[PDB]
Amino acid sequence: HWGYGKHNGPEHWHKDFPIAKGERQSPVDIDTHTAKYDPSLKPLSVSYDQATSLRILNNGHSFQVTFDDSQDKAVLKGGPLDGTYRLLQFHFHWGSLDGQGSEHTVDKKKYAAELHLVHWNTKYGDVGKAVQQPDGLAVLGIFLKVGSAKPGLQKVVDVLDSIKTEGKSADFTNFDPRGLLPESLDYWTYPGSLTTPPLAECVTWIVLKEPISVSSEQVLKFRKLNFNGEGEPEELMVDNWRPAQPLKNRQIKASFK
Numbered sequence: 001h002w003g004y005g006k007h008n009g010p011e012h013w014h015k016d017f018p019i020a021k022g023e024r025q026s027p028v029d030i031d032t033h034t035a036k037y038d039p040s041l042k043p044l045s046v047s048y049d050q051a052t053s054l055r056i057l058n059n060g061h062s063f064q065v066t067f068d069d070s071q072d073k074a075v076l077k078g079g080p081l082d083g084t085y086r087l088l089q090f091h092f093h094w095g096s097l098d099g100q101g102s103e104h105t106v107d108k109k110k111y112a113a114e115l116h117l118v119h120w121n122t123k124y125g126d127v128g129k130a131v132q133q134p135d136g137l138a139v140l141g142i143f144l145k146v147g148s149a150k151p152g153l154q155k156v157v158d159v160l161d162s163i164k165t166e167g168k169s170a171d172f173t174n175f176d177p178r179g180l181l182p183e184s185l186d187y188w189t190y191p192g193s194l195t196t197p198p199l200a201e202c203v204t205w206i207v208l209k210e211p212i213s214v215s216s217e218q219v220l221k222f223r224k225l226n227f228n229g230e231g232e233p234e235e236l237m238v239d240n241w242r243p244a245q246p247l248k249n250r251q252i253k254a255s256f257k
């Protein structure tokens with residue numbers, strides 16, 4: 001029922017999910033002058049060498065690549081995190097135009113898209129239990145700007161024709177998510193939430209400072225996806241981003257001076 005349109009978009013979500021007006025909702029604007037360097041943060045550890053991708057799918061609000069999280073293969077540790085977080089899936093949020101699409105903003109600047117690599121804290125045993133914990137998930141957020149192509153994204157782009165409509169999926173094995181990362185792991189971090197219903201307040205956000213560049217042709221292919229299912233009226237999957245939410249009683253910490 002929820003979506004991104006006028007009658008079911010983010011301004012309506014609170015009716016079914018009252019935590020939408022909660023104390024640690026995401027995304028937020030990152031005010032770079034107020035975020036404070038935290039020398040206590042340890043270096044991020046992104047260990048994706050053994051990642052095992054499974055499928056790519058259109059779920060009606062984004063497209064997502066899933067991973068086998070049956071074992072400690074692709075894991076995120078360090079930075080603000082205590083313990084080990086397993087990669088479950090990645091997906092994107094994007095705009096109808098290059099000047100919008102990201103969920104987080106930087107000094108109110110919106111990027112053309114935002115990649116979310118979703119990880120869960122293995123101390124809770126399974127992701128369903130983790131989403132009920134304030135420290136259950138860690139999402140690594142990476143901004144996309146339009147410029148040069150990202151070679152590591154092309155395998156994704158070239159299969160989107162096969163999952164145009166909600167409910168479609170395809171095999172997507174042997175995809176290496178390391179090809180989606182920027183050079184620098186400098187980041188901002190803050191406690192927040194899922195940015196789609198149920199908006200659970202279970203996420204440590206780690207947002208990389210350095211965007212990746214993708215080409216206009218790559219992002220154009222994102223915008224040809226459909227929110228609707230096959231055999232329904234075509235509604236292009238664009239502007240599937242939640243806007244910045246109030247920061248409230250939170251501090252955004254920087255890993256870098």
Ligand SMILES: NS(=O)(=O)c1ccc(CCN(Cc2ccco2)C(=O)CN(CCC(=O)O)CCc2ccccc2)cc1
Binds near residue numbers: 127128131139197198
């Ligand atoms: N944009 S964001 O902030 O990065 C972002 C926004 C939403 C989510 C979804 C997180 N959630 C919650 C959810 C609930 C409904 C929809 O979603 C799940 O992952 C749920 N689920 C699917 C995992 C999978 O198979 O992928 C786990 C399976 C499970 C097992 C036992 C009991 C309950 C659930 C992730 C990132």
Ligand SMILES: [Zn+2]
Binds near residue numbers: 091092195
């Ligand atoms: Zn997301």
